[PDB]
Design a protein around this nucleic acid. Structure first.
Lengths: 107, 52, 64
RNA sequence: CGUAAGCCCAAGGGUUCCUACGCAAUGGUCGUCAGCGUAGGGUUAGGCGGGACCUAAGGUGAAGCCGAAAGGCGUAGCCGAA
RNA sequence: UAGCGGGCGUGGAUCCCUGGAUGUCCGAAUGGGGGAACCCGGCCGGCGGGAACGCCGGUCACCGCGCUUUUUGCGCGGGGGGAACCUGGGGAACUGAAACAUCUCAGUACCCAGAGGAGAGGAAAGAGAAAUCGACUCCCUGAGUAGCGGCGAGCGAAAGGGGACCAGCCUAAACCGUCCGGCUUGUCCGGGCGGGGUCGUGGGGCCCUCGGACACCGAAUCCCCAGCCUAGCCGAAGCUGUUGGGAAGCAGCGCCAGAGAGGGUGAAAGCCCCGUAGGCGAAAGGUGGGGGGAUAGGUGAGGGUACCCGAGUACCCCGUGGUUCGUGGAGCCAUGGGGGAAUCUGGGCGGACCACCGCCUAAGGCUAAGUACUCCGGGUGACCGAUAGCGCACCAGUACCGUGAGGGAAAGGUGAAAAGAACCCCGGGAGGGGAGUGAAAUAGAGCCUGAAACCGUGGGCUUACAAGCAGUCACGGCCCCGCAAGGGGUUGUGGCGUGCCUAUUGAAGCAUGAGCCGGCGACUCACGGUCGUGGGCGAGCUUAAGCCGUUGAGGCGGAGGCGUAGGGAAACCGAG
């Protein structure tokens, strides 16, 4: 329900601070808690070495989430904002004085 | 009483001379731009105020 | 809200145009027979003063 | 102790029962123990009890009779017990 | 909110919006019963081998209105809720009068009944004095005036003037007919229907003559549509350096604006995000007199007749209520017992009563709006900040208490992020101690910021021949900063000294209240007065409701108030 923010499902930069000015993967969005995960927040998590899912010293982590509005879209340019447009056959949403958004599927 | 106020208000302003009475304007249409330019033409820099 | 203005107050006394409460002499309805006409003549009017100030507060709204 | 302090019934309480694990809190101290926490489990009916049987004081209540109202009384009928 | 886990989607899902289906047992409860949420039966279709027993579906409550062959069914409606507000029938007491009866609180609290986005009210048998008015209701006004009153406490009108909205209608009667019923056939006693008719310088009826029409007026009712809310969609501008865990901050150079409201982003931004102003959007649903079509409907002038115009009535008595009228010289309005009429020479009324003069047509029923309320949807606040604010921010009408009615809490903050601590070590665990997580672990998990009492580890000073509201003055020593000269903490001696509050004729009192600390907790406001003051005007001065406007914008509005003369109880006179 009108839960429309910004970030979607392409690949894009970091404008926060931890790893500001960096870039990462598809971005696997989750969820309404305004969290997005490119590759940014990487940590090293404990998890008891319990012989099941953990060897003789589990202590590993990878993708830890990070807030949405702390990232930004980049077009073949630098990193400028977005903007929509109706194709009279779909819904395109390019970039500030640029073309294309997240519609390389035929959009 | 309050009417004096009205009068006296402007009166003080007029006692200073900060009131312009242009018949119309040069920034006729609705644009921040043209009013800004006209504000150069009136010299109303960027450190004043408009009960306008 | 709004003062009640006393009915009796106006009903028996008047404050003259001076903030001076003036009206009635007391004592004539059972007097008589052995009454000298001297006092019946002096039972004409009176004057009142002092506490009559509070009496001016009584009437209030219409004054009178 | 043993006309009980032992053993049945009944109203009551609402899973305290059995079994395993376990003590930080509940036991006027402890506590490896429990009417304590926790999980799996246990309550079987044509003849016992009770209704698809009966009436009691009483309740109820078409009709009736009455009351400013809400209601009050109330026949037949229906509810009512260990 | 995860977790053993397993699906799901651009052949467009979760998701919100509308419409339908679906909804087991209770609850007015409705087959009947009943200790609500459970039990039992009839009656048509069915299910199982299915008559034994079972289930499922349909259907079975009374109340009222109109029909229907009174017989039997159908027919439209009824029952319960609701935060406040509303109409009616009931209705107090404290308390005010410094006591108490009249009076008062008060026709308020509550009891009940009923109607709804409203109510009730509402077409004058009125008003009031002018030959002036013209449905009902709300705000201002008049006015705390007119009066009511143990003439006490106090209670408190209407007309008029200003705004608010603005609506006016239909039956019974006389005339005439159609069906039915009875009947002392009779120019016939009633019920239904049918046209007829609705008024106050009187209307209606009948005959009759002026002349009566294609017309004039137009609904409160049904339809058409703009519109309004139930999902939404668009939306203008940024980049390097730099300290810092963190940049948005500070530096440099801009950009946008009909949009620099605000929230968020690891700090404090119009340009990073959601937004902003500005401007668009509904298949279905609701809503809709905002703008439109039509239907039911409504419009005459004269002459005589004397047919009609609301009956247990009007009026009279008795016993009342209401009005400001407490019985007053006591009317008007409505009504409980009895007495008991007229249709326009009948009549009710202008406050006993009468002459007169004006006003109004009762004894039948409907009517939007202007007003009110706040469960609810939005906005807004010189509103509160987790003892405050709804009683509750949080798992509250929950714990708990009570037979029941009912009472009624306590409890919010880790961090930007869970990264919420793997390993080892002591340890039975409980909890710690290195490591590691982050800016910070002085953020370690009821953890922000942790104050006060409060217990305690260590250190400095002094205390075992002393009699004390616990301090103050000075001297002195002991311990620590200071360049010196000065400062600090402590206490050996001695000069001195009856805690605090309240309450008193008077307290240290053997009067009074406080264990300690923490939070809360007590001179407000609205209206009318009276006085002083800072002001504007000033022989005048100022508007109330409301109209228009504005989003934190004012103006318009002279109705009304105080002022100019007072004196007398009054007529009435007048600087007397």
């Amino acid at each position: 329900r009108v839960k429309m923010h910004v970030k979607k499902g392409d690949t894009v930069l970091v404008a926060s601070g931890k790893y500001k000015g960096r870039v990462g993967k598809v971005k696997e969005v989750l969820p309404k808690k305004y969290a997005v995960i490119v590759e940014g927040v990487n940590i090293v998590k404990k998890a008891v070495r319990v012989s099941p899912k953990y060897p003789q010293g589990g202590f590993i982590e990878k993708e830890a989430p990070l807030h949405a509005s702390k990232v930004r879209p980049i077009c073949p340019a630098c990193g400028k904002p977005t903007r929509v447009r109706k194709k009279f056959l779909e819904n395109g949403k390019k970039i500030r004085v640029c073309a294309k958004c997240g519609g390389a599927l035929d959009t | 009483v309050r009417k004096k106020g009205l009068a006296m208000a402007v009166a003080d302003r007029a006692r200073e001379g900060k009131l312009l009475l242009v018949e119309a304007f040069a920034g006729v249409n609705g644009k921040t731009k043209e009013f800004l330019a006209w504000a150069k033409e009136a010299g109303l820099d960027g450190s004043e105020s408009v009960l306008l | 809200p709004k003062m009640k203005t006393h009915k009796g107050a106006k009903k028996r006394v008047k404050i003259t145009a001076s903030g001076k409460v003036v009206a009635m002499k007391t004592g004539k309805r059972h007097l008589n027979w052995q009454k000298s006409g001297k006092e019946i003549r002096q039972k004409g009017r009176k004057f009142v003063l002092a506490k009559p100030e509070a009496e001016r507060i009584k009437l209030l709204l219409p004054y009178e």
